[PDB]
Amino acid sequence: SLEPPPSTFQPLCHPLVEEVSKEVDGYFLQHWNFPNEKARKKFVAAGFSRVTCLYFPKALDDRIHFACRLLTVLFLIDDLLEYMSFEEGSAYNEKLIPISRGDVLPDRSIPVEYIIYDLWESMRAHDREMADEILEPVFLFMRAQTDRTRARPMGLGGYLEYRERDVGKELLAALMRFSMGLKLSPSELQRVREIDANCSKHLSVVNDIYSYEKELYTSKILCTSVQILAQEADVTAEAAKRVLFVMCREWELRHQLLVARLSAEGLETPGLAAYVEGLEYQMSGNELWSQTTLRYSV
Amino acid sequence: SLEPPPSTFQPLCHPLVEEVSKEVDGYFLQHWNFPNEKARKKFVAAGFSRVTCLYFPKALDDRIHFACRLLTVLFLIDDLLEYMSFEEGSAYNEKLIPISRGDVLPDRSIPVEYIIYDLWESMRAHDREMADEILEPVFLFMRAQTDRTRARPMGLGGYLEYRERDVGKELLAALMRFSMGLKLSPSELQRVREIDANCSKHLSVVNDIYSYEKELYTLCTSVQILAQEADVTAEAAKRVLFVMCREWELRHQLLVARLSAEGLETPGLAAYVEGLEYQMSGNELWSQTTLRYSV
Amino acid sequence: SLEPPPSTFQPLCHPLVEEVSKEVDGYFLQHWNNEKARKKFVAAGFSRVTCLYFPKALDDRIHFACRLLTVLFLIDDLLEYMSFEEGSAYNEKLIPISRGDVLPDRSIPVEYIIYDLWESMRAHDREMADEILEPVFLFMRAQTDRARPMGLGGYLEYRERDVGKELLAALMRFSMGLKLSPSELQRVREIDANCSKHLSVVNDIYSYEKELYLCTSVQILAQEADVTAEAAKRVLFVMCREWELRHQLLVARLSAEGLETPGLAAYVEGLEYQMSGNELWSQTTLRYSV
Amino acid sequence: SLEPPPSTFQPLCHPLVEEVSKEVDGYFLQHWNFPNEKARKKFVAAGFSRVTCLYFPKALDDRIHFACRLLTVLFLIDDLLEYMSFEEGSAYNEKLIPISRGDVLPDRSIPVEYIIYDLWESMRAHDREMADEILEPVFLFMRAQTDRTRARPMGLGGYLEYRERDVGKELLAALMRFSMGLKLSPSELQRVREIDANCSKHLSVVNDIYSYEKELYTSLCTSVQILAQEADVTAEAAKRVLFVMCREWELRHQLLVARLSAEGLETPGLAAYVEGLEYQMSGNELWSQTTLRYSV
Ligand SMILES: CC(C)=CCC/C(C)=C/CC/C(C)=C/COP(=O)(O)OP(=O)(O)O
Ligand SMILES: CC(C)=CCC/C(C)=C/CC/C(C)=C/COP(=O)(O)OP(=O)(O)O
Ligand SMILES: CC(C)=CCC/C(C)=C/CC/C(C)=C/COP(=O)(O)OP(=O)(O)O
Numbered sequence A: 001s002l003e004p005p006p007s008t009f010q011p012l013c014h015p016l017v018e019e020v021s022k023e024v025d026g027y028f029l030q031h032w033n034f035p036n037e038k039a040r041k042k043f044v045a046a047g048f049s050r051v052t053c054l055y056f057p058k059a060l061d062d063r064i065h066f067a068c069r070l071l072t073v074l075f076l077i078d079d080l081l082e083y084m085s086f087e088e089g090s091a092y093n094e095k096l097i098p099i100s101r102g103d104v105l106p107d108r109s110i111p112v113e114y115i116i117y118d119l120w121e122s123m124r125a126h127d128r129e130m131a132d133e134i135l136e137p138v139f140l141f142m143r144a145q146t147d148r149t150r151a152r153p154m155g156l157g158g159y160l161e162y163r164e165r166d167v168g169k170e171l172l173a174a175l176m177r178f179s180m181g182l183k184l185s186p187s188e189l190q191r192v193r194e195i196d197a198n199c200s201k202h203l204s205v206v207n208d209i210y211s212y213e214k215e216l217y218t219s220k221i222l223c224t225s226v227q228i229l230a231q232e233a234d235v236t237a238e239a240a241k242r243v244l245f246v247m248c249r250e251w252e253l254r255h256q257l258l259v260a261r262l263s264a265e266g267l268e269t270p271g272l273a274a275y276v277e278g279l280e281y282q283m284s285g286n287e288l289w290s291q292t293t294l295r296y297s298v
Numbered sequence B: 001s002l003e004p005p006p007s008t009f010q011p012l013c014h015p016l017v018e019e020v021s022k023e024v025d026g027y028f029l030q031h032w033n034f035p036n037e038k039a040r041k042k043f044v045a046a047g048f049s050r051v052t053c054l055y056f057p058k059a060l061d062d063r064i065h066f067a068c069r070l071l072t073v074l075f076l077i078d079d080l081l082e083y084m085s086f087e088e089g090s091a092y093n094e095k096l097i098p099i100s101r102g103d104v105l106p107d108r109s110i111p112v113e114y115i116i117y118d119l120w121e122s123m124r125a126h127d128r129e130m131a132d133e134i135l136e137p138v139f140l141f142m143r144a145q146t147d148r149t150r151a152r153p154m155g156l157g158g159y160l161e162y163r164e165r166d167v168g169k170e171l172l173a174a175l176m177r178f179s180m181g182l183k184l185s186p187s188e189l190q191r192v193r194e195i196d197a198n199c200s201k202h203l204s205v206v207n208d209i210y211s212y213e214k215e216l217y218t219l220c221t222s223v224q225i226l227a228q229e230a231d232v233t234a235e236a237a238k239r240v241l242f243v244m245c246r247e248w249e250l251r252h253q254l255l256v257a258r259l260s261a262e263g264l265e266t267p268g269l270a271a272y273v274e275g276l277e278y279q280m281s282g283n284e285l286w287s288q289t290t291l292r293y294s295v
Numbered sequence C: 001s002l003e004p005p006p007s008t009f010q011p012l013c014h015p016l017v018e019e020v021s022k023e024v025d026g027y028f029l030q031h032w033n034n035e036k037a038r039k040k041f042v043a044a045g046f047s048r049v050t051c052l053y054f055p056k057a058l059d060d061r062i063h064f065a066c067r068l069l070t071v072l073f074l075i076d077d078l079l080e081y082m083s084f085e086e087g088s089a090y091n092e093k094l095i096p097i098s099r100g101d102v103l104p105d106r107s108i109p110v111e112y113i114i115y116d117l118w119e120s121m122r123a124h125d126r127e128m129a130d131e132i133l134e135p136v137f138l139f140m141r142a143q144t145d146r147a148r149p150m151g152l153g154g155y156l157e158y159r160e161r162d163v164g165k166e167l168l169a170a171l172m173r174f175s176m177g178l179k180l181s182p183s184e185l186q187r188v189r190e191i192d193a194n195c196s197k198h199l200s201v202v203n204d205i206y207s208y209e210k211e212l213y214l215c216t217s218v219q220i221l222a223q224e225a226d227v228t229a230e231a232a233k234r235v236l237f238v239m240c241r242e243w244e245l246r247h248q249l250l251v252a253r254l255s256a257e258g259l260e261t262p263g264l265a266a267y268v269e270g271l272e273y274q275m276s277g278n279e280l281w282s283q284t285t286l287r288y289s290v
Numbered sequence D: 001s002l003e004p005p006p007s008t009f010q011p012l013c014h015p016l017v018e019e020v021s022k023e024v025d026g027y028f029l030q031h032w033n034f035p036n037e038k039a040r041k042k043f044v045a046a047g048f049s050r051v052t053c054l055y056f057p058k059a060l061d062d063r064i065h066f067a068c069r070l071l072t073v074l075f076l077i078d079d080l081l082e083y084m085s086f087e088e089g090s091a092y093n094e095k096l097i098p099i100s101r102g103d104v105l106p107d108r109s110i111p112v113e114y115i116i117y118d119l120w121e122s123m124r125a126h127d128r129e130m131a132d133e134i135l136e137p138v139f140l141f142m143r144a145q146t147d148r149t150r151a152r153p154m155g156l157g158g159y160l161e162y163r164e165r166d167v168g169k170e171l172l173a174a175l176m177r178f179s180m181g182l183k184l185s186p187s188e189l190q191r192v193r194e195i196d197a198n199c200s201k202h203l204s205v206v207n208d209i210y211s212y213e214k215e216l217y218t219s220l221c222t223s224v225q226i227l228a229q230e231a232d233v234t235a236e237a238a239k240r241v242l243f244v245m246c247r248e249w250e251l252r253h254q255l256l257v258a259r260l261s262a263e264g265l266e267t268p269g270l271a272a273y274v275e276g277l278e279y280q281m282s283g284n285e286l287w288s289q290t291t292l293r294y295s296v
């Protein structure tokens, strides 16, 4: 089997995982309309708060639950969207956006509506400025949840450049910033643009590596680095995964080189130091998640 | 400074290397017009016959010198062409082609001409049928070391497919079959299509890895291409490509076995298949030691 | 030979162009700094381009667009004479001044022109004027300084997101006093991308000479199809006609699927004017030496 | 619906088409083993000899039939190959190569075997030199009828370059030379390198434009799908753009020929050859618009 190559990175889980997980899991169990009990247990088995804590292990203790709640509902909606047309799905999320902004009252009789409204009111309550910062990154994601993928010739370079702008990864980095109380300035963000793009790729390719078996097992719009590299080099998908994993390690090193350079230049501010560290854990965390999540299972 | 990942391919060196060296080196030395001592000394140090013996370790004892002579002159000619124009260089080789077929002038006053002529007559003398089988393969290679290029976008996939058809590597394979007495009819040789391409690709990329520094003296190479596509340094690119080369080696064995599993393997292709493996490992040791890639 | 193929897009020209042109020209020829160029300016038709791009701009707003572009051009042809370091700073020093967080040196035309200009825009419509800030900054930033395998498909996808094209749509919305929600805009992303491609390729076709005096559809198609640059321009021109057709099909679908709002209808029609106007101008201006 | 854009070329058919067709058709009707008479009906309907005279209108009267007979058997083998595996079809054609070279006697009880043998034996008789010359071009094509084409990401450029080396179009050019009696030297051929590549693309794209609907089976690899995807337009739009690109290649062919002449590099053989390619293009276009091979 695969067997990942050596990495100087390692997965870390948020100290309070057990605590938040119980809290968040409990809240959705009492508020979200799960159909049958079977589903009720699929949810707990999922451990969305445990996923969040794996991604943002360095989050502030009094903010990690916000991140867990946001991702939990987002994972939930993503599941429902699967069973509805691009039309209703798009209509479904557009209704939640003004409600998320808090510009429109929720229909207290619809779980998702008041869970979203309450959640964002809570966030603006704890930190208004930062809460309003993640608004667009979230809307961008939600909207993309229903965008139709365009099939076109794509080599490795083009695919990777495309993944560098993944809205999901952007959501993760912006959310991680909220969870960590890192109020980075426009000049600080631009300073780590390469780091972000680099990180974005690592995350997406690691996902491709463990999601391939399922992507193909879809009575198979196949768009993945595994298939692209396998065809370009003319080797098996397994061989492709191997090569790609080494590339990921090269991106891990590039991450260090860029961070090292950032410091030498005297541009590594206190916040940026915390930020790039966070991204390192997203990379190692996303790797563990990919190897274990049932989402990639068959 | 770049540690090659593990490989099951072990390179060999033809036992007669030092013997053929003296033979062939002596023939060219003082027979071929060397501008000066230095030239002659550098020529010996280059050891083209030694290069040839790394690539064709299983060549037949009474055929190895034929390969050593052929490549020695080609390396020489290739050296003189850089100083010529796409105009001059082309007429040069194009003139030798008829000669090589024995159809024309051997001009005894011109080294390159009587050497080419004499070399091919010797080959037809030893094995007529097989000496002809490689005429076109060599010509293809000669009518290429002067060709221009059509610049267009080329990604990793495009560059690799392109290298799978490298005329240089086809010449090597064709000359190996000659040197080994292997000839298996154009059938099953057609059956080792994938094997040949996979191999040609492996040889080309290993060359890219070691020739990047020097080539960077002014780029069509897998190193720069992967580096730009994955957005990493060229050193990181070489490391990744090396792993890819190990994947092609694994694929090579799979192709070999599969040929067997369905009853296609034959004494000819069995030997051929192994000979290619020696080119790949041989090429790797050469690429790591050749002054051709030195700054 | 470059005879434009048939197009169903008919360009429009703002009726106040003569009035606003002499108005906006007189200004720059009064503060901004060889009189031989002082003539090249009045003949450059900077406000005329503006009027072909936003022929439906509000009468009291058209002069704003003109002034903005007339300076973005004046600065552009100014970057051609300075290094990335020089230009990048030169431009970056104007952003805060544009926001109004830094006052301008009344002795430097480029500075106070920018200052007063943005001040007058906020004073006319602060909200909408603020919305143009970022789009303009993105454009200016890029003006300063990828290097990798780029084929025709990659290039066009890349042009679907061109900043300059983004700037025109933002400036157009402001000029027409068109308030559109991020929601309504989402519905027209395909139309926006399609339009961006059209604008860029027509520009590539006509600016090929100047640029060649590189990253351009003309050169790329020429290499991929192995034909001349001129042969390439002809093929691309026909591709532009297909994008025009697609625009109409998309506009028709937006309507049929009941997703069109009055503001959106005006928006998509305006994009058409930009496309056809851009073509008229590109063919006539001496900027690309007719 | 699809109006081809204006062109300075025009299709042209070989004069003896009628008689040659009768002559070559009857031959196969007597030797080729068609099961029932619905294949003989279809066969005759396909008129492979008229196809040949459309592609090689400038052929010599005494050679044009060698071309028709060769393409007829190649077309027929092509169809049979459809009802055979890769391993099978491969072995099948490989069996016929030594027979073509005249090295192995054919089995007189197997039509395809003796028909091939007799054909080359007859060709080598009329012009041993030129006959031997198109041996490799035919074998390259036959062996190509059975290999697999690994699918990989490919833009227009990559696709077009691959089509420039199309063994089928190569076979066409070589057969045209043999049929027109044009014995070109390597220098002359090296001189017409760009012109061949340009022509090859033209033929392939024109074929793509008309075989697209057909290729949409779904019960792949073509300029139509690739361009439509790269420019994000319909396949129908792609066709219109590709067609114009084809007219540019016709212009390029003329420019390349003019240049060749102006450089004093055009020989009588080459002049006749490049003109022969012009007719291969106009001819392949008409064929593409009319062949049942691309229908439903
Ligand atoms: C679903 C969701 C709310 C994502 C928000 C961002 C986030 C928490 C990302 C981490 C988990 C991940 C890689 C999901 C995408 O899997 P995948 O891309 O291999 O499968 P998919 O993208 O087709 O859903
Ligand atoms: C004389 C000659 C080269 C004959 C070809 C036969 C051949 C492939 C011999 C093996 C030596 C080799 C890998 C050369 C490639 O040099 P390179 O491609 O890395 O450097 P270059 O091609 O730019 O000269
Ligand atoms: C028997 C035979 C075909 C001989 C080849 C000689 C040749 C190129 C004849 C011209 C006719 C032609 C363009 C066929 C293309 O079929 P296609 O390529 O459009 O359809 P296909 O290749 O997928 O079968």
Ligand SMILES: [Mg+2]
Residues within 6 Å of the ligand: C203, C204, C207, C208, C211
């Ligand atoms: Mg331009």
